[PDB]
Amino acid sequence: TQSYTNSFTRGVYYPDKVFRSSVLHSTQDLFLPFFSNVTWFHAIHVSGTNGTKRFDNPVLPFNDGVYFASTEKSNIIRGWIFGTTLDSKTQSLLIVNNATNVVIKVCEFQFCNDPFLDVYYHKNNKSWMESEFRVYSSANNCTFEYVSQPFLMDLEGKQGNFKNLREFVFKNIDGYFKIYSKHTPINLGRDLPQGFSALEPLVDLPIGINITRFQTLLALHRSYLTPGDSSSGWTAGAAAYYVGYLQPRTFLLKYNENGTITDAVDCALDPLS
Amino acid sequence: NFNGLTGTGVLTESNKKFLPFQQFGRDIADTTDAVRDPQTLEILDITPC
Ligand SMILES: *[C@@H]1O[C@H](CO)[C@@H](O)[C@H](O)[C@H]1NC(C)=O
Ligand SMILES: *[C@@H]1O[C@H](CO)[C@@H](O)[C@H](O)[C@H]1NC(C)=O
Ligand SMILES: *[C@@H]1O[C@H](CO)[C@@H](O)[C@H](O)[C@H]1NC(C)=O
């Protein structure tokens, strides 16, 4: 799947820590332009009865930060890998997640063969996937094994038509790595529903390594409820796994009286704007 | 003096709903309005003499 879909009004985060109230403020920062297009990368059982390769986890350019969204009821999505090398020459970043914990490890990951996969790849019969994650082989010189409270907190889905939506923004500038996160329990029947919501800053990890590639780590043993097609370009379908690229834009934000961003307008989309 | 932020005035408790990540308070003309105590977790209004 390589379709294209419009991102209506998403991708705004608090520029700075200072509190403000009831002020219209203009800022110039990296942002996701309104009404831009985003691709749908997909995970599917490509002949899941056999160990047939799926190629659902490709490598992307990472041009000046990445926007990310995911709309699923399970914990299938867990972990990202970054780096310009992913080799033995230079370090690599791992943001793998535990059951109720996260560990961030910048270290030299020499060989990453492939995500682990159960040959049966059926979750309609067995629902347990236990301790089957080993991707890195040789851990050479490295430090900064940051540990804290888990990024994701499981918003339980029940009664149907009600699942959590996760939004993330990854930036790496001037030796500082910033991850803005937001959980929206309300998604209803739309994968990318209309509405305005800010992105909460969560962590600030000093590393300082230049990033030019990234890849996503899926629980590739099985991922159910997955349509797929061989189409490319401007098409239609479903992938439940998005991505977007930021640009150096200028925004105007309307802080509420309590101190929460309510509306925003970009100064480059429309003459009226 | 708070964390290296010199100032002068009167300090009084105020009902400012500061979010956990938000630390300083500010308004028009880059004027500091509230500060966060380096030891206790309290937010207080600052008013010039
Ligand atoms: C963005 O994607 C849309 C389809 O979603 C396409 O029509 C358009 O040409 C693409 N490029 C833009 C808007 O620059
Ligand atoms: C998380 O899992 C990794 C992988 O085995 C392990 O090294 C680490 O100690 C675990 N941490 C927690 C808090 O579970
Ligand atoms: C790590 O540093 C040690 C000491 O300089 C060196 O012997 C080793 O080859 C280094 N390994 C990598 C992968 O850079």
Ligand SMILES: *[C@@H]1O[C@H](CO)[C@@H](O)[C@H](O)[C@H]1NC(C)=O
């Ligand atoms: C990022 O660092 C690597 C070193 O492994 C280097 O080869 C690459 O050119 C750097 N990226 C840029 C844009 O210079």
Ligand SMILES: *[C@@H]1O[C@H](CO)[C@@H](O)[C@H](O)[C@H]1NC(C)=O
């Ligand atoms: C600001 O927060 C208070 C406390 O929850 C609430 O009573 C008030 O309605 C809020 N103001 C809004 C939503 O405009």
